[PDB]
Design a protein around this ligand. Structure first.
Ligand SMILES: CO[C@@H]1COCC[C@@H]1[NH2+][C@@H]1CC[C@@](C(=O)N2CCc3ncc(C(F)(F)F)cc3C2)(C(C)C)C1
Ligand SMILES: [Zn+2]
Length: 330
């Protein structure tokens, strides 16, 4: 495990820092220059890129210290632990705000006034950074630079009280809160999208509008396509219900749900294994102890590579890159 750490992490963390810094800085430049931070969602996307930047700028010191002793001092050990937790806790909170922003705008039809868009986004973002700072305060206090087995190490030294409280709070803030928000928000968004979703016929091209409906053949307005009976047929050509296909939303705010939903799902796939093993390692209910100790180190690496995956999601899943690529040519 110690030799695997000296071999695997230095080149891995170097590649994550190169791909991560260039990618996340491009997101910041595209939000400031192309989008101009006009919408409310753009301010939280900018803070999410800053959350990743603050996190990934600590990788050169972790990459270096994976193969040799800690030589930056106790002051840098405390500072770089703060940037890790502010970047980690900060990031997950801005993903929750982007999910809440979409839930209220799609499910409840709420909108920020043009004059109060920049004012609301700035005040709530400062409050989020303050809550992310207070969540990192315990980790900055107890993480120190001490010597263990004649080797200088920058690691956590929490008493049994604050260590148990650290573990449960990291799970509540990084695993229970985002997952509890995911199930309530995205289901509610899926419910309202399904009712308003339009369906196009593959034969004649007849686009079924739910707001208008089809009063002619006994379909009152505002009815869902899934709620229409099986014996129903197309008004133009009279084809069957099985030939009708789905239509993508014309509104970019409705198509943007897939971008933020992926960001949330990818966060869980990378950070849940770490959050679960620290809970199993701290609260040894039935627990073999060496397996949980090595598993905490392996799952931490996975979580630390997550910083460079956010710009890759906006490139492939998001249409904001393909639109910018067409503008860059003609
Ligand atoms: C100062 O603490 C930091 C801020 O506060 C939270 C904890 C965080 N811990 C740091 C994060 C960098 C760190 C690390 O990433 N490690 C440990 C050693 C290790 N050894 C082998 C493998 C292996 F086998 F899986 F490859 C993985 C790993 C994972 C280390 C390189 C300095 C420990
Ligand atoms: Zn038809």
């Amino acid at each position: 495990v110690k030799q695997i750490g000296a071999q695997l992490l230095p080149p891995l963390y170097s590649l994550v820092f190169i791909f991560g810094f260039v990618g996340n800085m491009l997101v910041v430049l595209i939000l400031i220059n192309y989008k101009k931070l006009k919408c409310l969602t753009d301010i939280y996307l900018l803070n999410l890129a800053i959350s990743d930047l603050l996190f990934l700028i600590t990788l050169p010191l972790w990459a270096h210290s994976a193969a040799n002793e800690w030589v930056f001092g106790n002051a840098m050990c405390k500072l770089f632990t703060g940037l890790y937790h502010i970047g980690y806790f900060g990031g997950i909170f801005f993903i929750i705000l982007l999910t809440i922003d979409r839930y209220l705008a799609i499910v409840h039809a709420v909108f920020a006034l043009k004059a109060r868009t920049v004012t609301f986004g700035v005040v709530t973002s400062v409050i989020t950074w303050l809550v992310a700072v207070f969540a990192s305060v315990p980790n900055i206090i107890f993480t120190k630079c001490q010597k263990e087995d004649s080797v200088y190490v920058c690691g956590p030294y929490f008493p049994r009280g604050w260590n148990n409280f650290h573990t449960i709070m990291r799970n509540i803030l990084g695993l229970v809160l985002p997952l509890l928000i995911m199930v309530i928000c995205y289901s509610g968004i899926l419910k309202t999208l399904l009712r308003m979703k339009k369906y196009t016929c593959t034969v004649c091209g007849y686009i079924y509008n739910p707001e208008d409906g089809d009063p002619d053949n006994g379909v009152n307005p505002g009815t869902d396509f899934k709620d229409i009976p099986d014996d129903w047929v197309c008004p133009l050509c009279g084809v069957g219900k099985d030939q009708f296909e789905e239509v993508e939303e014309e509104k970019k705010r409705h198509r943007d749900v897939r971008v933020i939903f992926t960001i949330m799902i990818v966060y869980f796939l990378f950070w849940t294994p770490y959050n679960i093993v620290i809970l199993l390692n701290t609260f040894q209910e039935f627990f073999s102890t060496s397996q949980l100790d090595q598993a905490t180190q392996v799952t931490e690496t996975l979580g630390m590579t997550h910083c460079c995956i956010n710009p890759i999601i906006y490139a492939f899943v998001g249409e904001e890159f393909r639109s910018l690529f067409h503008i860059a040519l003609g």
